[PDB]
From Swiss-Prot, chain B:
Ca(2+) 4 binds at residues 139, 141, 143, 145, 150. Pfam families: EF-hand_7. GO terms for molecular function: calcium ion binding. Keywords: Calcium, Metal-binding, Muscle protein, Repeat. Ca(2+) 1 binds at residues 27, 29, 33, 38. This is Troponin C, skeletal muscle. Belongs to the troponin C family. Ca(2+) 3 binds at residues 103, 105, 107, 114. The gene is TNNC2. It comes from Gallus gallus (Chicken).
Swiss-Prot record, chains C, D:
The molecule is in a coiled coil structure that is formed by 2 polypeptide chains. The sequence exhibits a prominent seven-residues periodicity. It is found in: Cytoplasm, Cytoskeleton. Binds to actin filaments in muscle and non-muscle cells. Plays a central role, in association with the troponin complex, in the calcium dependent regulation of vertebrate striated muscle contraction. Smooth muscle contraction is regulated by interaction with caldesmon. In non-muscle cells is implicated in stabilizing cytoskeleton actin filaments. Homodimer. Heterodimer of an alpha (TPM1, TPM3 or TPM4) and a beta (TPM2) chain. Interacts with HRG (via the HRR domain); the interaction contributes to the antiangiogenic properties of the histidine/proline-rich region (HRR) of HRG. Interacts (via N-terminus) with LMOD2 (via N-terminus) and TMOD1 (via N-terminus). This is Tropomyosin alpha-1 chain. The chain holds residues 246 to 284 of 284 of the full protein. It comes from Oryctolagus cuniculus. The modification Phosphoserine is found at residues 7, 26, 38. The modification Phosphotyrosine is found at residue 16. Phosphorylated at Ser-38 by DAPK1 in response to oxidative stress and this phosphorylation enhances stress fiber formation in endothelial cells. Belongs to the tropomyosin family.
Curated annotation (Swiss-Prot), chain E:
This is Troponin I, fast skeletal muscle. One of its GO terms (biological process) is skeletal muscle contraction. The N-terminus is blocked. GO terms for cellular component: troponin complex. It comes from the Eukaryota. Keywords: Acetylation, Actin-binding, Muscle protein. It comes from Gallus gallus. Residues 94-114 are annotated as: Involved in binding TNC and actin. The lineage of its organism: Eukaryota, Metazoa, Chordata, Craniata, Vertebrata. Transmembrane segments: none annotated.
From Swiss-Prot, chain F:
Polymerization of globular actin (G-actin) leads to a structural filament (F-actin) in the form of a two-stranded helix. Each actin can bind to 4 others. Interacts with alpha-actinin. Identified in a complex composed of ACTA1, COBL, GSN and TMSB4X. Interacts with TTID. Interacts (via its C-terminus) with USP25. The lineage of its organism: Eukaryota, Metazoa, Chordata, Craniata, Vertebrata. This is Actin, alpha skeletal muscle. Transmembrane segments: none annotated. The modification N-acetylaspartate is found at residue 1. Signal peptide: none annotated. Belongs to the actin family. Its EC number is 3.6.4.-. Actins are highly conserved proteins that are involved in various types of cell motility and are ubiquitously expressed in all eukaryotic cells. The modification Methionine (R)-sulfoxide is found at residues 44, 47. Oxidation of Met-44 and Met-47 by MICALs (MICAL1, MICAL2 or MICAL3) to form methionine sulfoxide promotes actin filament depolymerization. MICAL1 and MICAL2 produce the (R)-S-oxide form. The (R)-S-oxide form is reverted by MSRB1 and MSRB2, which promotes actin repolymerization. Can be mono-ADP-ribosylated on Arg-177 by SpvB of Salmonella spp. This modification blocks subsequent polymerization and leads to cell death. The modification Tele-methylhistidine is found at residue 73.
Amino acid sequence: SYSSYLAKADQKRGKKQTARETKKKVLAERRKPLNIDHLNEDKLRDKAKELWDWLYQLQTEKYDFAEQIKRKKYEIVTLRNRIDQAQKHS
Amino acid sequence: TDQQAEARAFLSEEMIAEFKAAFDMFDADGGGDISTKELGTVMRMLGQNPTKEELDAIIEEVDEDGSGTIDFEEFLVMMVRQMKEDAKGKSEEELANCFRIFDKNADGFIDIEELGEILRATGEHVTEEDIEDLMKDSDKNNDGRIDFDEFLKMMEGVQ
Amino acid sequence: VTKLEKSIDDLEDELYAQKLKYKAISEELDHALNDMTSI
Amino acid sequence: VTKLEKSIDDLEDELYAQKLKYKAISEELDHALNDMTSI
Amino acid sequence: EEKKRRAATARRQHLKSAMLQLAVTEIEKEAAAKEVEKQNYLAEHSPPLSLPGSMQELQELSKKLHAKIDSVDEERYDTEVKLQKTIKELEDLSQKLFDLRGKFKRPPLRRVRMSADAMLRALLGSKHKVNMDLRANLKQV
Amino acid sequence: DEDETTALVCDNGSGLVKAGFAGDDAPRAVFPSIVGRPRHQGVMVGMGQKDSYVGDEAQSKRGILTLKYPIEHGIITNWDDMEKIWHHTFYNELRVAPEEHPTLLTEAPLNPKANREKMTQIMFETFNVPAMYVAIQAVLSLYASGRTTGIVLDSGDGVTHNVPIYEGYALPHAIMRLDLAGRDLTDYLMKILTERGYSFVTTAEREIVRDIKEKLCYVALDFENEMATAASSSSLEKSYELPDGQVITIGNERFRCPETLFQPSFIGMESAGIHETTYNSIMKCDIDIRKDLYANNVMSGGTTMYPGIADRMQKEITALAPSTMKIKIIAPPERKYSVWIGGSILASLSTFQQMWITKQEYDEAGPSIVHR
Ligand SMILES: [Ca+2]
Ligand SMILES: [Ca+2]
Ligand SMILES: [Ca+2]
Ligand SMILES: [Ca+2]
């Protein structure tokens, strides 16, 4: 089975490269330049925090998505045991 | 109509009473049945945004008289199925959670050890015999552990 | 030439991947034909 | 370029020969795993 | 002829309920504690901001944050994708079990519509007094 | 789960019904597509008078009933007798009540618009199913082999078809139908086997010629120098033991039977054969799509199961196709249920929910709704 090796390259490289740009496209949208530079002095104040919140915003979500996978990872472990237990080739 | 039977048999006057008040608001004109449009309005008030297809499917789910509308009877049926599904989901969720608490070692099982612990962890007074007994009764596949399936079964009923 | 040389390396690599992905299914095969002739 | 184009066509042809020689052994396979699970 | 055997079963139940009862009270403990961990984690990774002086600082900090944002955002994204991957892995497993058993309890994805209790609350607001669950009602005394 | 468990898949054939639950890997129910009507009045011991018989009880009791086939060449010809086979499928075979199960049904390649509307009329108005859907058979076969463009050679009990499909849409003007299939093929074996000096005299002799065809028949590649081989008489021969001892031998005819699918002239048919027809379908399609169809000849149906069918077809169309082309004949092992499995997949799918025709759609749009 070595004629399938060319399938590995094509496949993997393909999917991986597809995923990349998508991530780039996506991430790019959610990005609005720090255009506001030297337009006011107290502006920075009302600005800086807004960025701060956005960060905290993202941070908090990342934490949740995280805890989520863990919980899901456990759903799996169990869902796998139910699969084996429910084997009985009898 | 047979469904509208047990359905109304299931609910209480209290239930009907409120499900009516609720039904009335669904029904604009006050004619006697929710239309594919009268429903759409309430759905949005409820925070959804169904499509013509989606709405009908939701309608003809309890439309026994092929009317294309829902009467306070077909409605009670609908509320019932829901009431059911709701309670089922809440149950399995709770148990699901309980299993994770009892598991803790995360092997996806509950071995006689953990069973003892958790049991002994309750206020109740118990001796090993009790613990191993509950294990033997619960473990149907006689493999020593208690799988989620078995746990669902064993807890079947208990509150 | 650089275009065709690039396409020759991708096909020759997609290749040892195919040629190998097989030794495995043809060998899983002499095996999975022998046990049913036995049962 | 003509040298490399000649070597790309031999590998790409040695190829559909390998890729196909398989559909046959992997299909002879779902078959030769299904009859012993049945017998 | 095992006349007493009846009491044995009741015990398991008494115990089972002693278990569940235990579960629930432990369930909310872990829950809140969990949250505590969440606010501590956030406690240091993004502590109560304190706006600097005026000149270079505000600008600097702003640049600092803004860059971190693209950073954290990327991480947030990668995470979301590992979730997607995961949810995917269990959906497939949530299949390999269906067509091997049938509909089984506790599917991992759970397609849930809003509860009737919700719809009722949502529509009548104040007057919605029925702790509906299952308890039927038959004449009292 | 409501309907994840609950979707039914019923594939109606000329010879067999295949049925079961979307989700399963294979049909829960497979049985003849007959409806027997008793020629005389009387009863079996312990039963009452029965007006009708369906499936295997009609086959088993065939001597006292007049057997009838509702589906002639893949098309439903008698709607009274079809509603009888459906009734049997739901209530006895799958033992489900239909009024709480979505039902995915299949139809044939150029099934008349009016029929797709009629079985919808009967599904919703006499069986009261929640929702239903009619898929085209070749299209489910293709899809069950993963893809969306290809050409299916589909061959069962009463019809053979070629249905070129492009990104899911079966191409009406390129579809070919050849009315010679496994039924025709069992009757031809019958004669070349009586002609070998035999007698399939009682009904227990008749039925088993079909089990000879299934077990021992072959499609040889180079059917030319296979007859030549027959003559030198190698250990090519094959004896089958009948219901009793009567060991019958079949050496040669073993492959003379599927050579009928490439040469219809073996049976007084003037039509072209399977491989030429694959090809003609293909030179009737758009030019730009012909490389796709050629690398995706998916086979499905009971009669395409004869071993070496794929190799013969492989070489049959390579040698008719322009050499610049890639030929590829996919023939999976489960192919006698491709159609069904494609329906099981599709109907259990996460995205299919929004194509189910619901009683809401129907009571509001008339049979036209599902007809598309
Ligand atoms: Ca109204
Ligand atoms: Ca109505
Ligand atoms: Ca454990
Ligand atoms: Ca166990």
